[PDB]
Design a protein around this ligand. Structure first.
Ligand code: F43
Ligand code: F43
Ligand SMILES: C[C@H](OP(=O)(O)O)[C@H](NC(=O)/C=C\CCCCSSCCS(=O)(=O)O)C(=O)O
Lengths: 259, 296, 114, 221, 194, 351, 47, 251, 50, 93
């Protein structure tokens, strides 16, 4: 067979990117947020009530006979028939453990039937509501992919990914969805990801210490680990660029001899 | 020995820098947090200048040398009307603030006109309560020449006017008259820098004169002692609750309800009333402190 | 708008030219006024401002606001004449008849401005 | 100069309303191809690929040294040459896009299409194509299979842009090899993303056609 | 005609070629009669619509204070379905600085639904009569629809401890306010101050 | 370059282009040219030679600033979508008043930003707020200036201004080094990062500096855009972010289309423009593409980039806008001291 | 103006029916269907 | 002053004008006279504004957008929500940015002519809507004309976006549709708090700014290449409907 | 007839908020000829007065 | 202690003025918008209103089709004429 490498490089940032891309790597969990708390921060549905449906279950609807379409097993939320919801994250440039393109690549490498979108200060994944809640609790919130200070589940107004951290080390939030409770040392979400206030604040845990954030981040920084210390990634990027250029010029084997 | 500078850094890990300042004996005179950056006017000992610079470059902060952050300035506009207030006077005041000084806008009751101008004794004494006064005059030679009696105080004086050269027997800075625009042209910035240079020279001369016979206690550590003892100083809603003057302080409380508390403050082993002149201020019935020297 | 200042002070001329320009820009009056001439007499305090408008009462109120913006603080005794050319004299003293004659002279020389 | 308010229609638009010269055959949208084939997967893929690659022949793109790459792309992406699309879908019935990438790399190594270029200091043996056009065809077949796997898992057609984009991204940064159409497929996937996922977007993926400024960049891939 | 002394702010303005005021700063006019509240130190609020009102009040003979809000942009978090863009709010020290004045003048903007909740949050902590200066015509009844005390249109359940005493419409942000608007503000302040 | 030929520059009033569109201008100039020809040489008022004059002035000898964009683009000539990058490089007159090649490239960057991103993308194909902060990020502070001067210094230390022939290796070396430096400066200075808060701004500035450096190394415009695209895909792996989703369409197909020879994909960067199919959707690329096209010829010390007639015509001192110093003129217009044409105050009542 | 009458607001035109009259601070106030007090001088009688 | 000696207007050269009497011109059904130079479109601001008002007009229907909001997005559409949206678009259409002070905005006095209006053939929706930004068919038309127009329109709601004139001055006519569509989408995602990063927002964008757009003129092909909202694309019936003399006259 | 081709265009241009009122096109061209028509699109607030 | 009525300040840097590169002028961000900046509008206006026409085929048409000689005096007369006609002056009719 083929043993899959995931990312070039020898530094800790490349190792963290490889770990995020690896579906067989168990991400270290750092907090326990209950399922109903994740649902409440998500703000899509009331916990305890049934999922809203967009179509009948796949057994009820009649489709044409398609051999290639029926080879793929659908998701459970697709089997019952559920609306497609989203969960959106903002990641600070100051050593957040997960980063937008890294998030999108890891989501599309690890999860089935997801819709990943990458912006500079935004990253959103869309899926059926039950499966989306499942991997939001299991992977997105409780593991080392999330830090309540340098990252945040937020839709609507997103700003502060490139700004400096506040006095408590948290990312800037124009709507202030999550605040810092100095009596317990924990970050508490007082609003959901879109902005309406929550009736009961939910503990997402305490901020990750900066020393651990240096080890678990996936961003390259001059004050942390720079790409000049990782020449293998730059060489792979340059090889990809040269291969694209040679393929766009003349896509033959003799023109790729100068690769 | 206590160099006063301004620090411009971020709010992240700013409390650790404040702890370092407190450990090395520095005093935070002024603090202001805008959104994520903090402006901090700190007085630290002169033997820790390079250590504080190394500490500030560790947090990617900025050290701005402010030559006027130990004084307060009275800016005497003729009135607070549209002619002098909304431009020039705030430009002068904010340029004075940019170098650390604490300004006060003094709008004269009858400061307008050429021959109908007059200055009251209450306004006069309020001007003398400051360290240096800056007069923002007009842009006609004969008008200001027939208006010398306004600049009658035994305080260091810098007169700003429209004409380039004036023949008054006071310090004069030209090309700063009555205008309706924000001061942004090169000549206007040069004239503002010139006025800053003259007030800096006068403040340095007064500082040397005070250093000939030093006071018993410096005003900065006296302000620190007052904030340590008096617990009502954190309830003051004024812009600067305690203004550090050149040879004293201005505490913004009611004089009648707080002078017996202020005088009975033990600093070192001395009482304040025997070492300072606690008196009623003309500005909103505040408390003004004038320090005695070591000769008495 | 054409702006000129008649004064014997070299710095005051340029500064009050900038003042007139700023007051015309702030009230958005630079296109509705053809000429704006100000005569500065500071040895005896009296100032005359003449306005030649292009071709309602709101425009006259805006022009009066412009005179209030340009005229100095102490010149509080003011008297204006309007016969499609608006000329006002401001002084700290009661207005003399010679100053009014100079105002009519400015008004007549602004009437034939073309 | 169009038939706007009338009741007469054709599969091709006005020749003066083309994005570029020779773009007439890239006017059939996705929904027309799906409805013509009665919602059959492989037949709709074959229809779209036949029209797109015949259009690249019409554009003069598949002329000379590009004709082999376009013929291989048509054969392996639309007509299921060597059963590659069906094999990848069968191998990734429970899988994700990354598993499809892994199976594509394994198949290309086993068939001799790609070989190891060099091994860096931190492992990561680089890969180079022994057959450039065949590697492009294999990657295109795997792209179709990855879209089928992810959109059959979700049973929703909103995932197309992300699957193409991050299939190409994961393949490129997994092998050091170029993606489908040397980044043109990834650029067109970015176009699909901003066209079908925002208020700046308009419409869904069913109205995608090659005669649009958003979707014209990939030459039938 | 009397002396007018302003306790200036302690913080410098926005750079070199920018605004003179700073956010979250208060400038006391000694004798506390009228406080002018500005939403931000930016060009949309400072010296074009606010310092003009300030010099009109100072020319009328009334001592004036100018307070620049720390977070004056946007809508409060108690707006329906939360806040968007930015969160409007009031600090307790800002409320205490306002509350020592006889009257308040506050400058608002364009959207009718923003101004009502902004005024409700402002008057939840300010108990002195305030004058609202905005651009679009808002009626002095839509504030009472969400529970704001008001001189002419009272609510049954008043959710504010301060009363809107006058609405003045026609003042655009970032633009020079005319003399007529200043005269209306002065007449309202004189009729509702002494 | 011009030869022993005579040319006429017709500048119609700005009010004409404000009431009407850009396709009005050539026709206006053509009728007035024909009218002046028939009345200055005392010819017949309408004959076959008059039609010869009209055909000449309408096409045969006319030079348009921008081509017409019929069909999907649905636009006329002398529109900012028809202006090629070399034409806009020749519009800016920093070449004849300065010898600094970086300054010559950066004034073209500023002019291209203010045209393409602010007008042609800000309003012509969008609306409302537009892209002000997207375009001003290339000409507000000296971030792009510092990056481009570092690129010039690095090129002159190891290659020279024209010391190397355009090959792949020099493109990779120069673009990678300039991208690494620009991202290190973004990391080291939080003020720089907070100024360019959006990722698209940062990506455009770093890639513009890399492309300008490659052009100062080789003198080839297409190598410059190739360096731009390498810088974009290296930024994407440095920060794991590039811009808004929708930004990197042309950056992904760029490397393939930069040196392509296919009909829809090949064009020299001087001949490329906003109607180039990859470039016809996205902010943050076109104005810097014009600067890279200028920097290709600034390294050679060329008098012009694409058209000498445009350079001579826009060297005219009677133009309202001074094209020698576009940034100073923009600063003057931002401070309400720029006297603009096209106003109609003599035909309007007093307000 | 009394309970059951039809009244309108001159400033906006809000239709409503009078609920009660509740004097306070020696001043007359009119309570409408939307539970909002009004002033009688700012109200007019329509039919 | 400006040209530094370059000749601009020379009546001596060319035709000797005024050999015959240069007659004044009346205007029909009006008791006023003017010279012929005043009727030139460059010298007449009224003709320029006549074209400006037509160029800056885009009519967009909001019935598919409301249906998508109610069904697919799960957001209720009330007359209060329509009033909130109308306030948002009236703030945002000229240059405004809703609750974003950091965003660069156009000066409001520079776009005083910009308005966003609404009209509907549904009468109860018309009286339930705010009259500040409503084009009332009943009070602007005679009874038979209002009944005919309500029957022809139906029970549908349309918004009229008047893009500011300066936008048409700087740019071309095809700018207006993009400007109105962009501001309508922004005001819809602001007034109704919707996520702007999902495919449902793309479907709503099609329903709100690409489903029932009525443009004043079509694009022109060939050598007459022009965008939409240019006077070559305006049909004769559309221009007949622009003029409103059937409202006020029966002749 | 109330309209000729488009009812929506007829209702839209009945708006009183239009600066050019299309009810009397002959009368307003007279007003623009006598320089008493206040047109839009003037950049008077971003231009110097001198 | 958590008060939701405090608010969040936003955009401190965006309130500071923008410098312009290689100049010494500071300006607000709102004045750099193309609608609020008359210089950017004039920059596009000057490019839009510029048309270059080669007057060499016209001289050939004058010389060999009409038999009219072309001298620099006639070119100067033509330039004087077109500087009157191009703004919109009348030359015949
Ligand atoms: C607020 C929105 C909503 C939306 O649909 N688009 C917005 C807003 C939109 C509106 C702003 C006006 C308004 O009333 O909304 C416009 C003008 C759209 C247009 N016509 O080009 C715009 N953005 Ni956006 N937008 C910008 C930017 C950005 C940066 C901001 C980065 C940050 O983390 O703070 C990011 C894109 C990215 O993530 O890479 C961004 C996002 C967003 N942008 C998301 C973010 C929230 C969302 O999830 O819904 N803008 C910038 O990066 C600077 C240039 C700026 C553009 C206007 C200008 O050039 O002046 C503006 C461009
Ligand atoms: C030189 C031409 C050839 C051509 O292409 N256009 C001309 C001239 C042109 C110029 C006038 C330049 C100037 O003012 O000197 C313009 C304005 C076109 C332009 N944009 O330059 C014009 N005509 Ni013509 N032109 C007109 C007319 C006319 C009528 C004049 C009737 C008659 O008394 O003989 C005749 C046509 C005819 O053959 O009958 C006419 C001819 C001609 N017209 C013949 C010959 C003129 C001559 O007298 O030597 N115009 C008119 O009929 C009235 C409207 C008038 C147009 C301007 C306006 O509307 O004010 C003008 C329209
Ligand atoms: C301008 C361009 O067309 P053109 O280049 O051919 O003229 C035009 N582009 C668009 O409509 C599309 C998207 C532009 C919006 C991007 C603004 S960036 S700010 C928020 C973006 S994001 O947060 O959602 O990523 C088009 O119709 O294709």
């Amino acid at each position: 067979a083929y043993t899959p490498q995931f990312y070039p490089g020898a530094t800790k940032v490349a190792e963290n990117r490889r770990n995020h891309l690896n579906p067989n790597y168990e991400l270290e969990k750092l907090r326990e947020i209950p399922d109903e708390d994740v649902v409440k921060i998500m703000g899509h549905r009331q916990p305890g009530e049934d999922y809203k449906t967009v179509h009948p279950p796949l057994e009820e609807m009649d489709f044409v006979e398609d051999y290639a379409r029926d080879l793929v097993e659908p998701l459970n939320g697709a089997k019952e028939g559920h609306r497609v919801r989203y969960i959106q994250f903002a990641d600070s440039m100051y050593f957040a453990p997960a980063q937008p393109y890294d998030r999108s690549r890891s989501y599309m490498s690890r999860l089935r039937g997801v819709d990943a979108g990458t912006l500079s200060g935004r990253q959103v994944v869309e899926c059926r509501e039950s499966d989306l809640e499942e991997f939001s609790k299991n992977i997105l919130m409780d593991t080392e992919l999330f830090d309540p200070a340098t990252s945040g589940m937020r839709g609507a107004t997103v700003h502060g990914h490139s700004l400096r951290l506040d006095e408590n080390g948290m990312m800037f939030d124009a709507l202030q969805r999550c605040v810092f409770d100095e009596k317990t040392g924990h970050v508490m979400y007082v609003k959901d990801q879109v902005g309406k206030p929550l009736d009961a604040p939910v503990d997402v845990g305490e901020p990750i210490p900066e020393a651990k954030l240096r080890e678990i981040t996936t961003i390259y920084r001059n004050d942390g680990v720079a790409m000049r210390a990782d020449p293998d990634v730059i060489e792979v990027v340059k090889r990809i660029h040269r291969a694209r250029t040679l393929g766009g010029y003349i896509p033959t084997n003799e023109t790729f001899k100068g690769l | 020995m206590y160099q006063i500078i301004r620090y411009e850094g971020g709010v992240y890990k700013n409390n650790i820098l404040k702890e370092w300042i407190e450990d090395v004996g520095g005093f935070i005179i002024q603090e202001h947090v805008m959104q994520l950056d903090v402006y901090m006017t700190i007085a630290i000992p002169q033997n820790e200048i390079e250590n504080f610079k190394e500490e500030a470059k560790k947090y990617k902060g900025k050290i701005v040398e402010t030559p006027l952050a130990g004084i307060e300035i009275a800016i005497v506009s003729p009135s607070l009307s549209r002619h002098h207030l909304p431009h020039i006077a705030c430009d002068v005041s904010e340029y004075v603030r940019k170098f650390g000084a604490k300004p006060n806008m003094i709008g004269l009751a009858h400061g307008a006109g050429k021959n109908i101008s007059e200055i009251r004794e209450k306004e006069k004494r309020l001007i003398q309560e400051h360290d240096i006064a800056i007069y923002v005059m007009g842009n006609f030679e004969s008008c200001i020449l027939d208006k010398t009696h306004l600049f009658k105080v035994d305080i260091p004086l810098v007169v700003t006017g429209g004409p380039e050269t004036l023949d008054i027997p006071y310090t004069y800075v030209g090309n700063l008259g009555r205008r309706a625009q924000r001061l942004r042209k090169g000549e206007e910035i040069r004239a503002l820098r010139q006025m800053i240079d003259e007030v800096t020279k006068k403040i340095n001369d007064k500082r040397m004169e005070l250093s000939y016979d030093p006071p018993i206690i410096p005003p900065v550590v006296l302000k620190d002692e007052i904030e340590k003892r008096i617990d009502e100083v954190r309830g003051i809603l004024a812009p600067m609750p305690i203004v550090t003057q050149l040879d004293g302080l201005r505490i913004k409380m009611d004089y009648d309800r707080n002078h017996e508390e202020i005088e009975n403050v033990k600093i070192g082993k001395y009482l304040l009333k025997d070492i300072a002149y606690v008196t009623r201020s003309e500005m909103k019935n505040y408390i003004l402190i004038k320090l005695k020297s070591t000769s008495e | 708008a054409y702006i000129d200042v008649e004064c014997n002070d070299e710095a005051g001329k340029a500064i009050y030219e900038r003042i007139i320009q700023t007051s015309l820009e702030d009230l958005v009056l630079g296109k509705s006024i053809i000429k704006a001439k100000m005569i500065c007499k500071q040895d005896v305090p009296y100032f005359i401002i003449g306005i030649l408008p292009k071709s309602k009462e709101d425009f006259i109120d805006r022009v009066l606001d412009f005179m209030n913006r340009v005229f100095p603080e102490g010149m509080r005794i003011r008297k204006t004449i309007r016969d499609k050319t608006i000329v006002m004299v401001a002084s700290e003293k009661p207005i003399e008849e010679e100053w009014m004659n100079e105002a009519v002279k400015l008004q007549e020389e602004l009437k034939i401005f073309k | 100069m169009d038939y706007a308010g009338g009741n007469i229609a054709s599969l091709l638009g006005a020749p003066s309303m083309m994005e570029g010269l020779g773009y007439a055959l890239r006017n059939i949208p996705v929904n027309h191809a799906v409805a013509t084939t009665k919602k059959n997967m492989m037949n709709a893929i074959a229809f779209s690929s036949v029209m797109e690659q015949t259009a690249t022949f019409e554009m003069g793109d598949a002329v000379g040294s590009f004709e082999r790459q376009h013929l291989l792309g048509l054969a392996y992406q639309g007509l299921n040459a060597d059963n590659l699309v069906i094999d990848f879908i069968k191998a990734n019935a429970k899988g994700t896009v990354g598993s499809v990438v892994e199976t594509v790399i394994d198949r290309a190594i086993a068939d001799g299409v790609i070989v190891v270029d060099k091994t860096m200091s931190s492992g990561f043996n680089m890969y180079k194509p022994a057959d450039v056009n065949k590697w492009n065809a294999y990657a295109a077949a795997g792209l179709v299979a990855a879209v089928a796997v992810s959109c059959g898992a979700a049973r929703a057609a909103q995932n197309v842009a992300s699957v193409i984009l991050y299939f190409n991204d994961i393949l490129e940064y997994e092998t050091g090899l170029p993606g489908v159409d040397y980044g043109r497929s990834m650029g067109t996937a970015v176009g699909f993303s901003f066209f079908s996922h925002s208020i700046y977007g308009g419409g869904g993926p069913g109205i995608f056609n090659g005669n649009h400024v958003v979707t014209r960049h990939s030459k039938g891939f | 005609r009397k002396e007018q002394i302003v306790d200036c702010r302690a913080v410098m303005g926005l750079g070199e070629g920018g605004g003179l005021a700073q956010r979250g700063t208060f400038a006391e006019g000694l004798r506390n009669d009228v406080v002018v509240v500005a939403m931000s130190p930016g060009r949309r609020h400072i010296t074009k619509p606010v310092c003009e009102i300030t010099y009109g009040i100072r020319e009328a003979g009334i001592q004036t204070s100018v307070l620049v809000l720390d977070a004056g942009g946007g809508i409060p978090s108690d707006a329906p379905q939360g806040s968007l863009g930015s969160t409007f709010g009031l600090k307790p020290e800002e409320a205490k600085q306002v509350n020592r004045h006889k009257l308040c003048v506050i400058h608002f903007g364009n959207v009718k639904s923003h101004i009502i909740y902004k005024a409700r949050l402002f008057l939840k902590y300010v108990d002195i009569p305030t004058i609202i200066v905005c651009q679009t015509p808002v009626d002095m009844e839509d504030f009472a629809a969400i529970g704001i005390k008001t001189k002419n249109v009272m609510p049954l359940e008043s959710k504010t401890e301060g009363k809107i005493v006058e609405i003045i419409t026609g003042v655009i942000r970032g633009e020079s306010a005319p003399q007529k608007k200043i005269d209306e503000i002065i007449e309202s302040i004189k009729k509702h101050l002494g | 370059a011009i030869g022993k030929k005579t040319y006429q520059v017709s500048r119609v009033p700005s009010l004409v282009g404000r009431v009407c569109d850009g396709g009005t201008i050539s026709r206006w100039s053509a009728m007035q040219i024909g009218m002046s020809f028939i009345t200055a040489y005392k010819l017949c008022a309408g004959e076959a030679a008059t039609a010869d004059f009209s055909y000449a002035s309408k096409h045969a000898d006319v030079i348009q600033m921008g081509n017409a964009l019929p069909g999907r683009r649905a636009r006329g000539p002398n529109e900012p979508g028809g202006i090629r990058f070399g034409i806009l490089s020749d519009v800016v007159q920093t070449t004849r008043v300065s010898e600094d090649p970086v300054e010559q490239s950066l004034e073209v960057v500023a002019t291209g930003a203010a045209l393409y991103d602010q007008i042609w993308l800000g309003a012509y194909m969008s609306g409302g707020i537009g892209f002000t902060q997207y375009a001003t990020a290339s000409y507000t502070d000296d971030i792009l200036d510092d990056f481009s001067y570092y690129a010039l210094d690095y090129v002159e230390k190891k290659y020279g201004r024209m010391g190397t022939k355009a090959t792949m290796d020099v493109v990779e070396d120069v673009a990678g080094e300039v991208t690494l430096y620009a991202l290190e400066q973004y990391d080291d200075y939080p003020a720089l990062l907070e100024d360019h808060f959006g990722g698209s701004q940062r990506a455009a500035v770093a890639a513009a500096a890399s492309g300008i450096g490659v052009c100062m190394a080789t003198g080839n415009s297409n190598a410059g855009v190739n360096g731009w695209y390498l810088s974009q895909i290296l930024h994407k792996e440095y920060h794991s972010r590039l811009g808004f989703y929708g930004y990197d369409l042309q950056d992904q197909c760029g490397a393939s289309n930069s040196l392509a020879i296919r009909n829809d994909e090949a064009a020299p960067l001087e001949l490329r423009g906003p109607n180039y199919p990859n470039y016809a959707m996205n902010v943050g690329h076109q104005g810097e593409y014009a600067g890279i096209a200028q920097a290709a010829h600034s390294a050679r010390g060329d008098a012009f980039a694409l058209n000498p007639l445009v350079k001579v015509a826009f060297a005219d001192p009677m133009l309202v806008f001074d094209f020698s110093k576009p940034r100073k003129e923009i600063a003057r217009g931002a401070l309400r001291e720029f006297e603009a044409a096209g106003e109609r105050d003599v035909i309007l009542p007093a307000k | 103006i009394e309970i059951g009458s039809y009244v309108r607001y001159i400033n906006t035109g809000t239709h409503g029916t009078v609920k009660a009259i509740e004097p306070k601070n020696d001043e007359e106030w009119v309570l409408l269907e939307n539970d909002i007090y009004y002033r009688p001088e700012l109200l007019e009688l329509v039919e | 002053e400006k040209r530094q000696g370059i000749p601009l207007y020379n009546p001596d050269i060319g035709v000797p004008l005024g050999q015959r009497k240069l007659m004044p011109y009346k205007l029909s059904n009006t008791d006023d006279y003017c010279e012929g130079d005043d009727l030139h479109f460059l010298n007449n601001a009224a003709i320029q504004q006549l074209w400006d008002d037509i160029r800056r007009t885009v009519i967009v229907g909001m019935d598919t957008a409301h249906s998508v909001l109610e069904k697919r997005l799960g957001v209720e559409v009330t007359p209060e929500t329509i009033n909130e949206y109308m306030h948002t678009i009236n703030h945002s259409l000229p240059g405004g940015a809703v609750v974003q002070e950091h965003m660069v905005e156009v000066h409001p006095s520079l776009a005083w002519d910009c308005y966003a209006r609404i009209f509907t053939g549904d009468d109860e929706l018309a009286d339930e809507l705010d009259s500040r930004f409503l084009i009332d068919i009943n009070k602007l038309f005679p009874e038979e004309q209002a009944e005919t127009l309500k029957a022809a329109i139906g029970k549908k709601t349309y918004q009229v976006s008047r893009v500011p004139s300066l936008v048409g001055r700087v740019c071309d006519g095809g700018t207006i549709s993009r400007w109105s569509a962009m501001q309508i989408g922004m005001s819809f995602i602001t007034a109704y708090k919707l996520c702007a990063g999902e495919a449902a927002t793309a479907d709503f964008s099609y329903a709100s700014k690409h489903a029932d757009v009525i443009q004043m003129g079509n694009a022109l092909p060939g050598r007459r290449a022009r965008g939409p909202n240019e006077p070559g694309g305006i049909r004769f019936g559309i221009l007949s409907d622009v003029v409103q003399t059937t409202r006020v006259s029966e002749d």
